[PDB]
């Protein structure tokens, strides 16, 4: 019964209309989904704009006259110029007659602005189509009648605001260049009345209700007008003293005076800063004496949320930030100024103790600005000497917890590891450090006070807390490198002192937890400190193994990160044989490391090993480096010399899933020393490399086993995911090292080939379902690294991988994610380092890499995307390099136009503006091959074209006919101009895209201006 | 001078857990509610039932008792879950019937979650 | 006491994903693109008694639109979403709020950038300031990892209930009840179907 009001031969009720209506924004459940649909349909419905009238007279009801208005919005956005004159003056009349009736009844008026702001946004966007050319006299209209009445000149203000906003904050992506430099000079033009009468309004106006309007239209305008409208008039005045009294018109008169602040002022002109100075002074006052002096507790104030005060103290810090950051120095020489700029930044103070992150961050960079203004300007630091001091406390007191400290308090008072990294305070901590480094290094002697004081308070209890603790260990960690070696060495030392007497005095499963963190994240800042004193980072390092004992596994998972940490800075310190040391300190730790690390976790065992081998890689006596790592080894090899013997021995001991994880287990250790010695690893993946293929082998074969005993379900199990965790784990250590290879004909010549051997054709020959995506991975950095040595294995890889892949994720967008992108990556590397692979394709192969790269730009997925877009660029780039040869003119008959036509649809069809730079780019390239003469044969068969025309012609002749029947709704004109302005600025990147996005938005409407691809002239 | 649920209940073990739901019509299963899963035993009818929480909003994703007739199956992907059948949950409102899997953070916490489902079933037959 | 959020973004920023993580708790994987609006009751329990939010989960996608600034309508509260992975939907973020604004002129809006849980993010920490002119609250969130997923209505029932220190609170949990051969085909192939994310912490 609903749906009655979709058949349009009846005549439409509109009882019925406004009962779906009501249905939808009132009702629930079915009903109102029922209603959804059919109010879609109706909208859509391309002949419902023909109700509007209809439907704005006769309903009760003002959400079905909004909706009606939305179709009349997309009929002038998308086909005004369709209709017949007598519409487009009919359905002027209605909509100004409907805004008329609208205002001129107080309750309406009053109770319906929704509507009637909808009413006037659809009257701009008749503006935008016929405005001022077919309506010169809109404006000196608008100006006369807001003389008539109170609720026409409010509205009047929200059209010409709206209209402001339409042409000069949204016009670019919605007009073509042309347009949007039209309506830009028409309103420029006219602006000096639309200003009298907003400034009269302003001056003699006492209906809030307008004066809101006004000011809220003037901020728009704020955006692009001259100066001289707002310091050459007594506008600013108004607005720093009379607006700001009146709460009513504050927030709006803050905004505007936040964008005049904005504005880059003449600086050789005196008036003009003297007026800068004056509207800020005067709106401070008003603060002062209006709102709240500069000692009140904006914490709490905020934390009140009493009616807008949390929406005031934003809009505050943004105007103070804003101006100050333009225009303090304005405040600087003048001694009669001083207390004004002091008196700004103490509010500044006072709102950065605020908790709100956000605005904490709004005020941090300003603070940020300052302090790094004071590090290199002469004679400035010494005006906010006391700002910066309180700004000290402030930062010391709310630091965020750095991504090292692993320890937090849940909603319980115990002290626990973290679920998940505090990924959205990586950047705040950052910030916080950088202005504290200024502050440290503007007055080095007040920050060491202020820290040495809090801590000698959290000794006897006077201020003790974790919370306390905690910033403050943080602050002294995050100033590392600002105080002189000798300072930072008497610092620190009465840091750690003080630190452990707390840990002594604070007993509990909890205090020590936070204590111990604490003095990690401190110890670990410090490297500069730890290398000069050996004897006590070597009692850190002893320490730090301790904690990897530890059941409170915060501690213990942050002990590893910490002496990792020490060793990327301090390592040159464990390779060498201190004094009154037998042996240098990694032969400690290795011999003793399947104690140290008998309590870890196998992925923490892990970066145990890779630190070691971040140590072993200092040593440079090649026998001596190839000794420490075969000691580390040792263990992780003595469990692989017994795998082998079994495995090779008996092919079902791998069947056991303990096995399987012992062998992981060691490939990982593997992997973790290689990441950090790299190119000094090979001696020890020689010693595995030729048994642990053989294990790939293997491995491969109980998978594909067992998927066909199981089925595919298989790959599902623990089994099974074992078994290709040690596949991808092989493939891992071996990408790992060939990456960082220095010597690439030992790569060649014993790498390469037992590794083609051992993947390819298993990846090749196994089922969709369990082919490894790391394989495609590897053979990247395998063509990365040498693939320019190795013709003929390229060769190899394309025949084994290409085909098969393709076939996997050639049939939708969302399968096989990973195997989707590791393919582009490898087409491309190939593309770039090998394409003579490609030449040795069949026909019929290099048509399937036509379309796989075609493919890749209807993807949204931006990792193939862009690799799709510059496969298509690289190769463009191969086939010229090759000049005028049969395989090159041979391309471009078969797969120029393809190119041309693919690039086209995706710049065009919406839903991949993402790459349009790059599908602009590559679509320039193509043009300027024909229009360079570097198609050396025709691109057109003998007899579709007279005999030498040239390339040129016929190119202009396939877009004009390709873009007729993809876009008939452009005239053969647009078409005709648009390429002609195209194919001119094949060499001007900036332009072309220009033209191309005047294009995009033509194809939107209906009688575009073809005249407006001239813009560039 | 004049100056300025589960309270009823003993918890028998705690674990953090991530909890499923099978839906048939799609042949998939969908998370309900990852949080602490709770055995609480009442002390005025010595019942035991499971009582989870979402982490958070704290909202209800499971609450039944641990009935005799329940038993845990192993799940073909997974060596640290368990899938059961549930025919009175009232996490939702009223007691539907559901298929459920839980899994845990180790193949250890899942053994230990059994045995502790079992010492609780024993608890709900006296 | 119940209110009307509608939620708007670009298509693909995960707006129906995380609205379906607050009804059922799924995560949903695919990405079927919501026609027009779809409407979720959505109720939070806080020590200021129970709040209901009426979520009209817009759509993104232009061509599946629908009414458009139609849903926004008597809204009392909105979340504008976009995703950290891609940069162009938070250069909508301005269209987006534009839209909302010229309806809803006065009213707690949220802005989310979700799919923090990706590693290779775009849109920088840095670069997101423009809820700051404009009185948005922010919020880094993963519908995926249920990163900050509950900070948005946490604060706008805040907003909208008037008392900052509104918090969530434990429904209470009633005692449940003591209760064929269709839970032994059932089962079967529950335990065939293997469960998902093997490879999470949990
Ligand atoms: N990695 C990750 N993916 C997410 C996250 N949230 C949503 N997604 C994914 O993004 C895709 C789209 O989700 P969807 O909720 O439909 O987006 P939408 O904003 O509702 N699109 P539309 O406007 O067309 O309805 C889904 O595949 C979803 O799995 C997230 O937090 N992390
Ligand atoms: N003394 C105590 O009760 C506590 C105090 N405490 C907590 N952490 C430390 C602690 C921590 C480290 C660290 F570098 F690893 F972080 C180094 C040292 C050192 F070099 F001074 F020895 C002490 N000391 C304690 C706890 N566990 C082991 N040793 C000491
Ligand atoms: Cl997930
Ligand atoms: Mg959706």
Same mark, same amino acid.
């Given at each position: 019964?609903?749906?009655?009001?979709?058949?349009?031969?009846?005549?439409?009720?509109?009882?019925?209309?406004?009962? +779906?209506?009501?249905?939808?924004?009132?009702?629930?459940?079915?009903?109102?989904?029922?209603?959804?649909?059919?109010?879609?349909?109706?909208?859509?419905?391309?002949?419902?704009?023909?109700?509007?009238?209809?439907?704005?007279?006769?309903?009760?009801?003002?959400?079905?006259?909004?909706?009606?208005?939305?179709?009349?919005?997309?009929?002038?956005?998308?086909?005004?110029?369709?209709?017949?004159?007598?519409?487009?003056?009919?359905?002027?009349?209605? +909509?100004?007659?409907?805004?008329?009736?609208?205002?001129?009844?107080?309750?309406?008026?009053?109770?319906?602005?929704?509507?009637?702001?909808?009413?006037?946004?659809?009257?701009?966007?008749?503006?935008?189509?016929?405005?001022?050319?077919?309506?010169?006299?809109?404006?000196?209209?608008?100006?006369?009648?807001?003389?008539?009445?109170?609720?026409?000149?409010?509205?009047?203000?929200?059209?010409?605001?709206?209209?402001?906003?339409?042409?000069?904050?949204?016009?670019?992506?919605?007009?073509?260049?042309?347009?949007?430099?039209?309506?830009?000079?028409?309103?420029?033009?006219?602006?000096?009345?639309?200003?009298?009468?907003?400034?009269?309004?302003?001056?003699?106006?006492?209906?809030?209700?307008?004066?809101?309007?006004?000011?809220?239209?003037?901020?728009?305008?704020?955006?692009?007008?001259?100066?001289?409208?707002?310091?050459?008039?007594?506008?600013?005045?108004?607005?720093?003293?009379?607006?700001?009294?009146?709460?009513?018109?504050?927030?709006?008169?803050?905004?505007?005076?936040?964008?005049?602040?904005?504005?880059?002022?003449?600086?050789?002109?005196?008036?003009?800063?003297?007026?800068?100075?004056?509207?800020?002074?005067?709106?401070?006052?008003?603060?002062?004496? @209006?709102?709240?002096? +500069?000692?009140?507790?904006?914490?709490?104030?905020?934390?009140?949320?009493?009616?807008?005060?949390?929406?005031?103290?934003?809009?505050?810090?943004?105007?103070?930030?804003?101006?100050?950051?333009?225009?303090?120095?304005?405040?600087?020489?003048?001694?009669?100024?001083?207390?004004?700029?002091?008196?700004?930044?103490?509010?500044?103070?006072?709102?950065?103790?605020?908790?709100?992150?956000?605005?904490?961050?709004?005020?941090?960079?300003?603070?940020?600005?300052?302090?790094?203004?004071?590090?290199?300007?002469?004679?400035?630091?010494?005006?906010?000497?006391?700002?910066? @001091?309180?700004?000290?406390?402030?930062?010391?007191?709310?630091?965020?917890?750095?991504?090292?400290?692993?320890?937090?308090?849940?909603?319980?008072?115990?002290?626990?590891?973290?679920?998940?990294?505090?990924?959205?305070?990586?950047?705040?901590?950052?910030?916080?450090?950088?202005?504290?480094?200024?502050?440290?290094?503007?007055?080095?002697?007040?920050?060491?006070?202020?820290?040495?004081?809090?801590?000698?308070?959290?000794?006897?209890?006077?201020?003790?807390?974790?919370?306390?603790?905690?910033?403050?260990?943080?602050?002294?960690?995050?100033?590392?490198?600002?105080?002189?070696?000798?300072?930072?060495?008497?610092?620190?030392?009465?840091?750690?002192?003080?630190?452990?007497?707390?840990?002594?005095?604070?007993?509990?499963?909890?205090?020590?937890?936070?204590?111990?963190?604490?003095?990690?994240?401190?110890?670990?800042?410090?490297?500069?400190?730890?290398?000069?004193?050996?004897?006590?980072?070597?009692?850190?390092?002893?320490?730090?193994?301790?904690?990897?004992?530890?059941?409170?596994?915060?501690?213990?998972?942050?002990?590893?990160?910490?002496?990792?940490?020490?060793?990327?800075?301090?390592?040159?310190?464990?390779?060498?044989?201190?004094?009154?040391?037998?042996?240098?300190?990694?032969?400690?730790?290795?011999?003793?490391?399947?104690?140290?690390?008998?309590?870890?976790?196998?992925?923490?065992?892990?970066?145990?090993?890779?630190?070691?081998?971040?140590?072993?890689?200092?040593?440079?006596?090649?026998?001596?480096?190839?000794?420490?790592?075969?000691?580390?080894?040792?263990?992780?090899?003595?469990?692989?010399?017994?795998?082998?013997?079994?495995?090779?021995?008996?092919?079902?001991?791998?069947?056991?899933?303990?096995?399987?994880?012992?062998?992981?287990?060691?490939?990982?250790?593997?992997?973790?020393?290689?990441?950090?010695?790299?190119?000094?690893?090979?001696?020890?993946?020689?010693?595995?490399?030729?048994?642990?293929?053989?294990?790939?082998?293997?491995?491969?074969?109980?998978?594909?086993?067992?998927?066909?005993?199981?089925?595919?379900?298989?790959?599902?199990?623990?089994?099974?995911?074992?078994?290709?965790?040690?596949?991808?784990?092989?493939?891992?250590?071996?990408?790992?090292?060939?990456?960082?290879?220095?010597?690439?004909?030992?790569?060649?010549?014993?790498?390469?080939?037992?590794?083609?051997?051992?993947?390819?054709?298993?990846?090749?020959?196994?089922?969709?379902?369990?082919?490894?995506?790391?394989?495609?991975?590897?053979?990247?950095?395998?063509?990365?690294?040498?693939?320019?040595?190795?013709?003929?294995?390229?060769?190899?890889?394309?025949?084994?991988?290409?085909?098969?892949?393709?076939?996997?994720?050639?049939?939708?967008?969302?399968?096989?994610?990973?195997?989707?992108?590791?393919? /582009?990556?490898?087409?491309?590397?190939?593309?770039?380092?090998?394409?003579?692979?490609?030449?040795?394709?069949?026909?019929?192969?290099?048509?399937?890499?036509?379309?796989?790269?075609?493919?890749?730009?209807?993807?949204?997925?931006?990792?193939?995307?862009?690799?799709?877009?510059?496969?298509?660029?690289?190769?463009?780039?191969?086939?010229?390099?090759?000049?005028?040869?049969?395989?090159?003119?041979?391309?471009?008959?078969? /797969?120029?136009?393809?190119?041309?036509?693919?690039?086209?649809?995706?710049?065009?069809?919406?839903?991949?503006?993402?790459?349009?730079?790059?599908?602009?780019?590559?679509?320039?390239?193509?043009?300027?091959?024909?229009?360079?003469?570097?198609?050396?044969?025709?691109? /057109?068969?003998?007899?579709?074209?007279?005999?030498?025309?040239?390339?040129?012609?016929?190119?202009?002749?396939?877009?004009?006919?390709?873009?007729?029947?993809?876009?008939?709704?452009?005239?053969?004109?647009?078409?005709?101009?648009?390429?002609?302005?195209?194919?001119?600025?094949?060499?001007?990147?900036?332009?072309?895209?220009?033209?191309?996005?005047?294009?995009?938005?033509?194809?939107?409407?209906?009688?575009?201006?073809?005249?407006?691809?001239?813009?560039?002239? | 001078?004049?100056?300025?649920?589960?309270?009823?209940?003993?918890?028998?073990?705690?674990?953090?857990?991530?909890?499923?739901?099978?839906?048939?019509?799609?042949?998939?299963?969908?998370?309900?509610?990852?949080?602490?899963? &709770?055995?609480?035993?009442?002390?005025?009818?010595?019942?035991?039932?499971?009582?989870?929480?979402?982490?958070?909003?704290?909202?209800?994703?499971?609450?039944?008792?641990?009935?005799?007739?329940?038993?845990?199956?192993?799940?073909?992907?997974?060596?640290?879950?368990?899938?059961?059948?549930?025919?009175?949950?009232?996490?939702?409102?009223?007691?539907?019937?559901?298929?459920?899997?839980?899994?845990?953070?180790? &193949?250890?916490?899942?053994?230990?979650?059994?045995?502790?489902?079992?010492?609780?079933?024993?608890?709900?037959?006296? | 006491?119940?209110?009307?959020?509608?939620?708007?973004?670009?298509?693909?920023?995960?707006?129906?994903?995380?609205?379906?993580?607050?009804?059922?708790?799924?995560?949903?994987?695919?990405?079927?693109?919501?026609?027009?609006?779809?409407?979720?009751?959505?109720?939070?329990?806080?020590?200021?008694?129970?709040?209901?939010?009426?979520?009209?989960?817009?759509?993104?996608?232009?061509?599946?639109?629908?009414?458009?600034?139609?849903?926004?309508?008597?809204?009392?509260?909105?979340?504008?979403?976009?995703?950290?992975?891609?940069?162009?939907?938070?250069?909508?973020?301005?269209?987006?709020?534009?839209?909302?604004?010229?309806?809803?002129?006065?009213?707690?809006?949220?802005?989310?950038?979700?799919?923090?849980?990706?590693?290779?993010?775009?849109?920088?920490?840095?670069?997101?300031?423009?809820?700051?002119?404009?009185?948005?609250?922010?919020?880094?969130?993963?519908?995926?990892?249920?990163?900050?997923?509950?900070?948005?209505?946490?604060?706008?029932?805040?907003?909208?209930?008037?008392?900052?220190?509104?918090?969530?609170?434990?429904?209470?949990?009633?005692?449940?009840?003591?209760?064929?051969?269709?839970?032994?085909?059932?089962?079967?192939?529950?335990?065939?179907?293997?469960?998902?994310?093997?490879?999470?912490?949990?």
């Amino acid at each position: 019964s609903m749906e009655g009001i979709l058949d349009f031969s009846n005549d439409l009720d509109i009882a019925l209309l406004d009962q +779906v209506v009501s249905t939808f924004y009132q009702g629930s459940g079915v009903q109102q989904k029922q209603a959804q649909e059919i109010l879609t349909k109706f909208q859509d419905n391309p002949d419902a704009w023909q109700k509007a009238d209809q439907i704005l007279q006769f309903s009760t009801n003002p959400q079905s006259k909004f909706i009606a208005l939305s179709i009349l919005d997309k009929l002038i956005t998308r086909k005004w110029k369709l209709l017949p004159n007598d519409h487009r003056i009919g359905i002027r009349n209605f +909509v100004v007659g409907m805004i008329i009736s609208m205002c001129q009844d107080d309750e309406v008026f009053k109770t319906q602005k929704n509507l009637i702001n909808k009413s006037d946004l659809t009257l701009v966007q008749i503006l935008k189509q016929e405005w001022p050319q077919n309506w010169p006299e809109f404006i000196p209209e608008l100006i006369g009648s807001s003389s008539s009445s109170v609720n026409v000149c409010e509205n009047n203000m929200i059209v010409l605001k709206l209209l402001s906003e339409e042409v000069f904050d949204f016009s670019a992506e919605q007009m073509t260049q042309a347009k949007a430099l039209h309506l830009k000079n028409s309103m420029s033009k006219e602006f000096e009345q639309i200003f009298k009468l907003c400034f009269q309004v302003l001056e003699q106006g006492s209906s809030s209700s307008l004066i809101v309007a006004t000011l809220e239209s003037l901020l728009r305008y704020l955006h692009w007008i001259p100066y001289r409208y707002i310091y050459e008039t007594n506008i600013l005045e108004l607005l720093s003293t009379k607006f700001m009294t009146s709460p009513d018109t504050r927030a709006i008169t803050l905004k505007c005076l936040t964008e005049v602040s904005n504005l880059k002022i003449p600086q050789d002109n005196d008036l003009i800063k003297r007026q800068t100075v004056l509207f800020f002074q005067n709106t401070l006052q008003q603060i002062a004496t @209006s709102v709240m002096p +500069v000692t009140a507790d904006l914490k709490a104030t905020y934390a009140n949320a009493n009616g807008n005060d949390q929406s005031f103290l934003q809009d505050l810090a943004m105007f103070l930030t804003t101006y100050l950051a333009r225009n303090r120095a304005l405040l600087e020489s003048d001694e009669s100024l001083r207390e004004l700029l002091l008196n700004a930044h103490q509010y500044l103070i006072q709102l950065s103790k605020i908790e709100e992150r956000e605005l904490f961050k709004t005020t941090l960079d300003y603070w940020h600005n300052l302090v790094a203004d004071l590090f290199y300007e002469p004679l400035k630091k010494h005006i906010y000497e006391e700002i910066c @001091s309180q700004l000290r406390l402030v930062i010391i007191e709310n630091m965020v917890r750095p991504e090292e400290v692993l320890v937090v308090e849940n909603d319980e008072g115990e002290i626990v590891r973290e679920f998940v990294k505090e990924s959205d305070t990586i950047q705040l901590y950052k910030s916080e450090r950088e202005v504290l480094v200024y502050l440290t290094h503007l007055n080095v002697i007040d920050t060491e006070e202020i820290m040495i004081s809090k801590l000698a308070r959290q000794i006897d209890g006077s201020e003790w807390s974790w919370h306390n603790i905690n910033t403050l260990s943080w602050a002294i960690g995050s100033i590392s490198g600002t105080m002189s070696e000798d300072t930072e060495k008497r610092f620190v030392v009465t840091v750690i002192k003080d630190l452990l007497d707390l840990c002594v005095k604070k007993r509990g499963k909890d205090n020590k937890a936070v204590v111990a963190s604490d003095i990690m994240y401190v110890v670990g800042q410090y490297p500069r400190f730890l290398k000069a004193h050996w004897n006590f980072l070597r009692t850190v390092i002893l320490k730090l193994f301790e904690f990897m004992h530890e059941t409170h596994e915060g501690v213990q998972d942050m002990a590893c990160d910490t002496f990792i940490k020490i060793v990327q800075k301090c390592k040159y310190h464990f390779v060498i044989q201190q004094p009154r040391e037998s042996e240098p300190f990694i032969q400690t730790i290795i011999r003793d490391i399947q104690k140290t690390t008998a309590d870890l976790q196998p992925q923490q065992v892990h970066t145990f090993y890779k630190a070691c081998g971040i140590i072993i890689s200092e040593e440079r006596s090649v026998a001596e480096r190839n000794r420490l790592l075969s000691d580390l080894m040792q263990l992780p090899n003595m469990a692989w010399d017994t795998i082998v013997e079994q495995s090779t021995a008996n092919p079902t001991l791998l069947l056991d899933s303990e096995t399987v994880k012992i062998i992981a287990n060691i490939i990982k250790t593997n992997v973790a020393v290689c990441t950090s010695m790299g190119a000094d690893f090979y001696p020890q993946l020689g010693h595995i490399y030729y048994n642990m293929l053989q294990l790939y082998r293997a491995v491969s074969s109980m998978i594909s086993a067992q998927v066909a005993a199981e089925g595919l379900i298989a790959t599902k199990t623990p089994k099974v995911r074992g078994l290709r965790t040690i596949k991808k784990e092989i493939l891992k250590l071996v990408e790992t090292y060939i990456s960082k290879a220095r010597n690439l004909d030992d790569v060649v010549k014993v790498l390469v080939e037992p590794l083609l051997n051992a993947v390819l054709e298993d990846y090749m020959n196994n089922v969709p379902d369990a082919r490894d995506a790391e394989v495609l991975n590897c053979m990247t950095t395998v063509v990365e690294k040498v693939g320019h040595m190795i013709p003929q294995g390229v060769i190899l890889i394309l025949q084994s991988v290409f085909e098969c892949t393709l076939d996997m994720i050639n049939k939708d967008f969302t399968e096989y994610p990973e195997h989707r992108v590791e393919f /582009y990556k490898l087409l491309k590397v190939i593309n770039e380092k090998s394409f003579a692979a490609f030449l040795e394709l069949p026909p019929a192969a290099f048509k399937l890499f036509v379309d796989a790269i075609c493919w890749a730009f209807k993807h949204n997925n931006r990792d193939v995307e862009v690799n799709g877009l510059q496969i298509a660029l690289d190769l463009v780039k191969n086939i010229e390099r090759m000049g005028n040869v049969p395989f090159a003119n041979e391309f471009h008959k078969n /797969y120029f136009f393809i190119f041309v036509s693919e690039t086209f649809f995706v710049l065009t069809d919406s839903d991949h503006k993402s790459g349009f730079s790059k599908q602009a780019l590559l679509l320039m390239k193509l043009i300027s091959l024909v229009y360079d003469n570097k198609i050396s044969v025709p691109l /057109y068969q003998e007899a579709e074209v007279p005999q030498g025309t040239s390339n040129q012609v016929y190119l202009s002749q396939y877009l004009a006919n390709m873009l007729s029947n993809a876009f008939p709704h452009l005239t053969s004109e647009q078409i005709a101009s648009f390429l002609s302005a195209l194919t001119k600025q094949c060499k001007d990147l900036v332009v072309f895209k220009g033209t191309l996005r005047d294009f995009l938005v033509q194809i939107k409407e209906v009688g575009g201006d073809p005249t407006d691809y001239l813009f560039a002239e | 001078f004049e100056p300025v649920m589960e309270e009823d209940e003993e918890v028998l073990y705690k674990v953090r857990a991530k909890l499923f739901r099978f839906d048939a019509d799609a042949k998939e299963w969908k998370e309900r509610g990852t949080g602490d899963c &709770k055995f609480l035993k009442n002390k005025k009818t010595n019942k035991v039932r499971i009582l989870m929480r979402r982490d958070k909003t704290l909202k209800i994703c499971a609450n039944h008792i641990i009935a005799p007739e329940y038993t845990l199956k192993p799940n073909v992907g997974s060596d640290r879950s368990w899938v059961y059948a549930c025919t009175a949950d009232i996490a939702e409102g009223e007691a539907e019937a559901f298929t459920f899997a839980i899994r845990f953070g180790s &193949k250890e916490n899942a053994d230990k979650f059994k045995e502790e489902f079992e010492k609780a079933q024993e608890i709900n037959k006296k | 006491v119940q209110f009307k959020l509608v939620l708007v973004g670009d298509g693909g920023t995960g707006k129906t994903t995380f609205v379906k993580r607050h009804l059922t708790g799924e995560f949903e994987k695919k990405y079927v693109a919501t026609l027009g609006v779809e409407v979720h009751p959505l109720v939070f329990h806080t020590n200021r008694g129970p709040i209901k939010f009426n979520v009209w989960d817009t759509a993104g996608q232009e061509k599946f639109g629908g009414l458009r600034d139609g849903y926004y309508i008597q809204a009392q509260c909105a979340i504008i979403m976009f995703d950290v992975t891609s940069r162009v939907t938070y250069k909508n973020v301005p269209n987006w709020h534009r839209d909302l604004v010229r309806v809803c002129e006065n009213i707690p809006i949220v802005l989310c950038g979700n799919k923090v849980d990706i590693k290779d993010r775009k849109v920088k920490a840095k670069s997101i300031v423009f809820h700051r002119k404009k009185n948005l609250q922010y919020y880094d969130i993963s519908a995926k990892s249920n990163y900050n997923f509950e900070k948005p209505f946490l604060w706008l029932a805040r907003k909208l209930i008037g008392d900052p220190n509104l918090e969530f609170v434990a429904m209470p949990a009633l005692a449940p009840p003591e209760v064929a051969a269709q839970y032994e085909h059932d089962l079967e192939v529950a335990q065939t179907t293997a469960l998902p994310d093997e490879d999470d912490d949990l």
